[PDB]
Design a protein around this ligand. Structure first.
Ligand SMILES: COC(=O)c1cc(O)cc(C(=O)OC)c1
Ligand SMILES: COC(=O)c1cc(O)cc(C(=O)OC)c1
Ligand SMILES: COC(=O)c1cc(O)cc(C(=O)OC)c1
Lengths: 291, 291, 291, 291, 291, 291
């Protein structure tokens, strides 16, 4: 990367300026998962990018998933799952494992990675300082709503305490578990939780790291890939997308309808995708705006 | 507890006043472990007592252990241990389990218990916001110092950031793991870590919840139980005590020699032992002062 | 008080917790008078209790009377009183004496008693920093309203400056005198003044120390004593009570109708009645709520 | 005062500027007593002048005496005095009267006068918020030191709390009574107390209102009146002055030797003497500087 | 000024008190121009008066003109003017000169004069920190509106940033130039700009230094001079006044109709006219109030 | 700049991170002059770069020169210069012009350019709020020290007030003129003034924009260009450099010897030289460190 003339290095940096101005002092919530979480190079770059935002006076908040790591731990422990439709039932036992994996393993890795750059990252769940609560959610399988245990949606968010935490200079790394109104901790889908945090904190952007180039309208025709789409158009496209894309699209819809100026589906397999998406006009992602 | 005349209920409360004055606005570090951690009634009372201190303008900091829960998880996972002397070698694998159990299971229970009373508890390790670091420690077995893996002592403490956290109204619940100067996370003995936190934070008292009435000089003669002892006298008694008492005594010595006005060995099998030890003159504990 | 087992001392303290939570950070206004003011043991306990609240992060405000001490000083000075009905006419001369006794004698004793525990108490009237004003009040005697000199009701309260004073850590000890809109100082009934201060400061509780077990509906049938009563029921009972109880009941009505969550008539002859009433479920007082 | 040309009114005001700059943001302690306290016109002007300083961003602190009012109250109460030399013995009874007169009568008048201009004045003694303490003082009569009861000198001053009070915009009006280290309240000579407050608060000036034109070296030769004198020269003149001047001179010596840049003996019989002394070059007072 | 008795010096100072109270903590905007700007004695007195206000806890803001100095610089540079009616057309060249003269010459003199008394003055235009913007204004000549170049009126004012600047202790000295919404800097009439600043900052008074005794209704009958007039009466007098008085009267109208409690036309040829107008009842000015 | 692959745009941005961390929250003083000031493209890029730093939480302070613009204005005004050696004598007349040009023309252009990006820039001299003073400097011509009028060096700097100004979010744009201890304004060489400001403000870096690639040791051998040099080595090279380089080298020496971690001589003819020098490893400048 040294053969590149220095007067073009300048123009790349200078071209970051309008986005540095837009985001200065703003909250950016980032859903982190997928291959950006499993490969060491993409991992280290993601943590560096969070340090970058933070050393620009931007306020990143990281929400992470970890579905496959939970499954692997359950298999190691010999915990036999029950399944309704495609969903595992989250017994009290499965939740203890889920919480222990997400908060005590997956979150820890990211906190330490980020903290290689400074005392920034702080790991938390909804349990800590009552930062957010959960409401038990049902799923509908083959047409009927049904209970799958201690799984929920974000209910209320302690917006004040959370913003104090970021104004203090910290990068929260959120593991999506929180108590319901009776103190019973539930596990929350990380995609939906990121949308709820973005809306509650008045975030400027929601970023959804996924393992795809971007949203295709008629997958897999290559030319169906789009750069920007409004909520109304995307809401009506929702029942046609592949299974994996629906949670990310439902998140983007709830966020931007909830007032978040834009939500982005970006390719987590690209090194420094966050830097590319926020400070460059040449991202592969797809931007969701209201309309 | 209602047949008791109300004019004696008054005198019990009024008799708390000199200790409310002594501790108002002060840090109190509490090592929590033993039966006070395993029985639901003692557990719930301990969390209530932390809420009590906090609703008195006292600043509790909780450090917790969890040795037996780590062992049980290692056995569930089929992780064969290596043992030098009586010590398990903490491989990278054992540490991941230890961190996951201590921070993602044991700490979570206490945070949620305390938080039943309000948004007080916040769980953390040395990894979060670089709150404290670890230095790898050796043990000496049968006369020779020897390496037992990723085990250490508290190195430096981010005293400023930690006191900000408690001035903000929070009750930190500390899981004793922290990175060394290279970012490699170690597990720290909870007793020694509590002493280091008490000294670093300028605590007024260190409380060590143990499963014994108090320090016996010639166990098990019943009349060898003492109420108060100075560091010099106790340092010379150290090589005679039962195996389980040495870590708690070494902690009390390091703390009070380190400037902490008093350290207390109190019986964690007594419901509300904290309330008894701090606000009553009739505790069964033993108080350590300098001299 | 030492023969009492220590595990019951614990339960008494632990049972204070729900009230410590309710009152933490809250204003509690206390009308202090009667035998709680004349006997040294009850006096010293009252001052200790104010120190207690304050060392719990509660914000006590004390309003005191002193009718009999004024009378005794007037007799010592040979000031002949004029009387309309049962009321002394407060000439400019009587007011100077009243102010001098209440502020320069009675208030001083309480400030010094409280201050034996720390730099807490601060004595004041409405004159100081224009903290509250008075409006001249009439009385009605044998059916007709009539002027009895420089006697009034609290008019406006400098709520902001007063709360600054308590947020600063101080325990105001208020002598009920204040200027009217022309700067002419009036003496205010201490019971009514306490109700006005409680309402103006947004107090959580008003406590009225009196020399009786509590409110009797049909004095003196012993079983007419009640524990709790709403404002509507008590307002209609008002014209039947003994002469001495009316000012305390009118105060409780004005306070709780004014928004104060509860007002309490408690027995000032009981040592530590404040501690008993606030932190115990076994008080002899009577609680007034709205309805 | 209207026949005076307006271009000379201008020059008088403009000539205040160098002293407005010198005193802006500074503490000025003022001993108030004498005829400036007994005549209504001089009284009202003094209170106006305190409002003036305060509406210039200057921080006045007022210390007042009241010897003759105490005597008159003792005579009204039939309290027979005991006298050693020329000193009344301050029994516990005499002190209660002294405190009640100074704090509950004399201080009240000044607070209300000042407060006619705004919410400025606040009355206090050493008892309030433990603002200052007293140490019992002896007197020497006919050559021998001797006890005259509960009379003392200022011991320690809560400098921090006092300056908070003035930074908050208040004009403390101090009645010179304070507890000793055992809580026993003593009465303090107002002149000496003013010097101790000036030194403790880092005052820029001490003003001593007296009933004389200024310090005469050889009273009563008219030409012995001086405008300025250093501490060394005045210390050696001390044993020759008239009885009434010694307390004021001892105060000026202790203050300016204690670090106070200048102390002034000014004529309290002149209307607005404070305004004249501080903002004009034509004062009749005498200025004391170190040397 | 020394033959004047000192008890009349006192009364002049004491008579400032009601105006010191009215203006304490308030913004006073002062249009400075005319002979008060050209003569060294009047200049130095004006700067002293600004120091005076500031050493009274008053917040002066100075707006200055400089028409004749611009003309003289244009003549020195050989810049030929174009004139429509009586107005010079402000080409880009004339503006550069105007800005350079007003900000780099005329403002500098006043900043240094004021700063002889302390670090008070700070020079600024609308360009600095975007403190205010301009909107291009037309003039009407011989009946028709017409463009005269880069001349405008104050558009929006950064009220927050400006008050921060004065709360910080500074005396802004404003040169009336500001960018329009496209960043193109315009020159603003100093009289109108002073009115807009007074209204935007919530000033207590606007002072307009002019070279006349005050407003005459039927110039030049001597007895037509008035002391006070309401906006309605003065608005209807507007089309009759001499050419030079209209900008000052239009300013006073816009200010006081805009909410400014009073605007004053005062004689800038009088030494210390500001001190005379604000702190004395004997000013020659004319006061404008709403009605 | 769009044909460049986006995964290399990423690496350029990511490579800024170590310098974003080093400079976050730090003062950077920038001497701005030369062709970076005369060409519109380089001008606009410089202002953008100042906005960039500021939108990264870096604190730029800009010091500007303007020698040639002063000369041109003097020629336009027909002001005949006097010359001793190669130096113009700065008469009171030349200074008024210099101040008017630097502060009222050259500084204004940069403030408005920067402010196109936000309310950042604020123009000032040493005169404003007494921000810094000047001491008259002599020059030595043909071997003898000699007076050349109102020219000086920075004397003292109001470090506190200046850092308040930058902590408030502002970008000071400094015109190098300041009063001496008698209030007489002098003109200061902009290069030396930048070094004095960097040292006084505890800057992390001093940047000197010049019209050369960097420091050559044996100009003009191309291979004598160096990347980094210590103060000791450069001090001994000083008497050999071309005339134009000495002021920039003397500045770098005074700054880094004064404690500034590094000073940089960078090529002001390169677009975005600031971005290149601070956030890239490929700058053409020369870095000066202590040794
Ligand atoms: C020292 O860093 C912090 O302030 C910190 C650290 C944490 O681990 C959690 C929290 C938190 O949840 O605040 C409500 C705050
Ligand atoms: C040093 O303690 C204080 O702040 C204090 C003391 C007093 O005696 C009165 C007041 C008061 O009335 O504040 C408005 C405040
Ligand atoms: C050090 O004084 C200042 O704070 C100061 C000085 C200036 O010359 C301008 C400003 C300003 O415009 O603030 C927005 C502030």
């Amino acid at each position: 990367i040294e053969a590149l003339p220095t007067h073009i290095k300048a123009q790349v940096l200078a071209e970051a300026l309008p986005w540095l101005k837009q985001l200065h002092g703003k909250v950016v919530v980032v859903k982190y998962g997928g291959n950006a979480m499993t490969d060491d190079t993409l991992r280290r770059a993601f943590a560096a990018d969070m340090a970058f935002l933070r050393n620009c006076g931007i306020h990143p908040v990281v929400v992470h998933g970890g579905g496959p790591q939970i499954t692997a731990m359950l298999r190691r422990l010999g915990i036999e799952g029950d399944f309704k439709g495609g969903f595992r039932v989250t017994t009290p036992e499965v939740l203890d494992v889920a919480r222990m994996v997400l908060f005590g393993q997956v979150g820890r890795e990211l906190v330490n990675l980020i903290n290689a750059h400074g005392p920034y990252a702080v790991g938390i769940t909804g349990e800590d300082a009552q930062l957010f609560t959960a409401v038990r959610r049902s799923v509908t399988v083959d047409g009927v709503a049904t209970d799958i245990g201690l799984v929920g949606d974000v209910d209320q968010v302690n917006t004040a305490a959370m913003l104090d935490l970021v104004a203090a200079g910290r990068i929260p790394v959120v593991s999506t578990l929180a108590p319901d109104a009776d103190g019973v901790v539930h596990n929350i889908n990380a995609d939906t939780a990121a949308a709820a945090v973005a809306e509650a904190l008045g975030a400027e952007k929601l970023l959804m790291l996924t393992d795809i180039d971007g949203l295709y309208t008629r997958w897999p025709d290559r030319d169906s890939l789009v750069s920007e789409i409004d909520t109304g158009t995307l809401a009506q496209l929702l029942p046609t997308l592949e299974s994996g894309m629906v949670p990310k699209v439902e998140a983007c819809l709830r966020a931007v309808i909830g007032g978040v100026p834009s939500a982005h589906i970006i390719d987590g397999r690209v090194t420094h995708c966050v830097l590319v998406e926020l400070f460059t006009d040449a991202g592969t992602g797809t931007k969701v705006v209201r309309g």
